[PDB]
Amino acid sequence: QVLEGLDAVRKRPGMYIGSTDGAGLHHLVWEIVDNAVDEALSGFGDRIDVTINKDGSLTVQDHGRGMPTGMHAMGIPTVEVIFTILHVGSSVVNALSSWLEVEITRDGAVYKQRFENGGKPVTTLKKIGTALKSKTGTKVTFMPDATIFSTTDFKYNTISERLNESAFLLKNVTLSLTDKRTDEAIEFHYEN
Ligand SMILES: CCNC(=O)Nc1cc(-c2nc(C(F)(F)F)cs2)c(-c2cncc(C(=O)O)c2)cn1
Structure with missing residues (x-):
């Protein structure tokens, strides 16, 4: 396996997210949401909150374990490795972002x-x-x-429909969507 830097994604976006239109834009959401969903699937966290921010940025917050906060080699945090080395979702989103914050x-x-x-x-x-x-x-x-x-x-109706589906497949996890551009909000939760 040959590791790469983020310029490999920026030079061939379609190989990672399919396209560079709206379909591809929203794939960025899906990659980050899927990481939160994976953590919930393993039993860590029972809510996943997505917010379309006024400035055009997008937040996904989970209540899982937290990504590991320790160091890799050479004092580089694990988080920085996850987000800066292409082996994949976190690093692809980072590559295709003008900025990204992980808290x-x-x-x-x-x-x-x-x-x-x-x-x-x-x-x-x-x-x-x-x-x-x-x-x-x-x-x-x-x-x-x-x-x-x-x-x-970002399209509120598109994200809304996807989160609803994801909530139906997860069970017992709340997925919420807030749009700070329009004040629209919805929550999905399916018990079993
Ligand atoms: C809002 C996006 N939410 C979001 O990424 N949550 C998330 C990601 C990870 C990830 N960790 C990694 C890595 F690489 F550190 F394992 C990659 S993703 C963990 C995590 C925490 N502890 C252990 C593991 C594990 O699999 O062993 C995974 C927890 N929450």
Whole structure:
């Protein structure tokens, strides 16, 4: 297996997200949502909140374990490896974003790393705050790169329908959508 940097994604976006129109834009949402859904599927967290922000960016927040906050080789945080080395969802989204923030809560601490310009770290993984020990999760916010996509307008109805489906397949997990551009909001939850 040959590892690559994020320029490989930026040079062939369609190989990773299919297209660079609205279909491809929304694939970015699906990759991050799927990581939250995978964590919920393993039993960590019972809500996944998606927000379309006024500035055009998109947030997905889970209440799972939190991504690991330790170091890889050479003092590089694990999180930075996940987001900056292509082996895949997190790194592909980072590559195709003009900026991305990951915020992790676990062990009584809140950490954040920020990337800009297609995934270049502008900070390390730094502790920015504290939280109760019981609090855990990951929050990813990303601004899709307007120089790559022909549209950067997230579609509330499109995300809504996908989250509803995902909620039906997961069971016993709340998926919520808020649009800060229009104030629209909906929640989905299916018991079994
Ligand atoms: C809003 C997006 N939400 C979101 O990415 N949540 C998330 C991702 C991971 C990921 N971790 C990794 C890596 F690489 F660290 F394992 C990749 S994704 C974990 C996690 C936490 N502990 C252990 C594991 C594991 O699989 O062993 C996985 C928890 N929440």
